[PDB]
């Protein structure tokens, strides 16, 4: 934790990784920095392809204006699309707003692949997030680079035996999207290994990346913040900083 932040071994590993990425063209293709956390015991939670948001108090990873954003909505799509286009808060926020049925009708196969090429961030209504794996294809879902997030757009609460009225709240939408872009995410798995993106090579400094790593450690290991946090059991044996192609460089060896 605090020793993991204050250890000069982690900082030296970060300069070593940056220099290796600069020198090696294969690593120069990579642009993202991941940490590999060795949880002491098995996590015991099945993977469900649902990203869980890890807050970053000190710095922001991305701004929503920087990314290309695809919104996937439930399909009386006119209300959501018209509200988000007309409202000035979310007018330029989304690169494309589509419904799940229209997405299934339009994009197939190689068209889906060029969609994945075009769009960097995918967010969707939580009501259609479970339908997304068949529509988006498997080549979105493998690797967890661009897993679609879950946003709730109406702010109303579903009650048993009663309908839920459909509205769109652009302030709530931009708040959730800002949180998603500024904060990092993790997906639980069954075994001990975990992978969390902590920083981007060009846009982040080394103390910023180290502070993001420290915040990630505290959020995951903290007994509170259940159920989004507190998933690591038995402590962290070792963390390994690496890009997509680079080898793992160990920090916080216990």
């Amino acid at each position: 934790s605090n020793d993991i932040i204050k250890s000069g071994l982690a900082e030296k590993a970060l300069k070593a990784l940056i220099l290796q990425c600069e020198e090696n063209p294969s690593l120069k293709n990579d642009k993202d920095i991941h940490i590999i956390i060795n949880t002491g015991k098995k996590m015991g939670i099945n993977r469900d392809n649902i990203p869980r948001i890890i807050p970053l108090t000190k710095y922001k990873l991305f701004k929503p204006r920087d990314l290309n954003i695809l919104l996937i909505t439930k399909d009386p799509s006119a209300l959501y699309r018209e509200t988000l286009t007309k409202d000035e808060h979310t007018s330029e926020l989304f690169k494309e707003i589509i419904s799940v049925k229209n997405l299934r009708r339009r994009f197939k196969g190689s068209k889906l692949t060029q969609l994945y090429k075009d769009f960097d961030l995918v967010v969707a209504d939580y009501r259609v997030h479970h339908l997304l794996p068949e529509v988006l294809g498997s080549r979105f879902y493998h690797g967890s680079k661009k897993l679609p997030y879950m946003i709730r757009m109406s702010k109303e609460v579903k009650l048993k035996r009663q309908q839920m009225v459909e509205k769109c709240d652009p302030i709530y939408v931009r708040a959730q999207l800002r949180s998603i872009c500024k904060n990092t995410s993790y997906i639980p798995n069954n075994d001990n290994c975990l992978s969390v993106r902590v920083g981007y090579i060009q846009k982040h400094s080394i103390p910023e990346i180290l502070q993001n790593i420290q915040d990630t450690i505290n959020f995951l290991t903290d007994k509170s913040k259940r159920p989004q946090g507190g998933v690591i059991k038995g402590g962290i044996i070792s963390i390994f900083v690496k890009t997509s192609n680079s080898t793992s460089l160990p920090i916080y060896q216990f």
Partner: peptide, 25 residues
């Protein structure tokens, strides 16, 4: 906290909202 009885995954999948997020900037 929120709960949808149809969709249990909303509670982990929900992004936390803050006053800095609900701000004009």
């Amino acid at each position: 906290f929120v709960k949808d009885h149809r969709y249990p995954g909303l509670t982990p999948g929900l992004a936390p909202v803050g006053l800095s997020d609900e701000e004009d900037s």
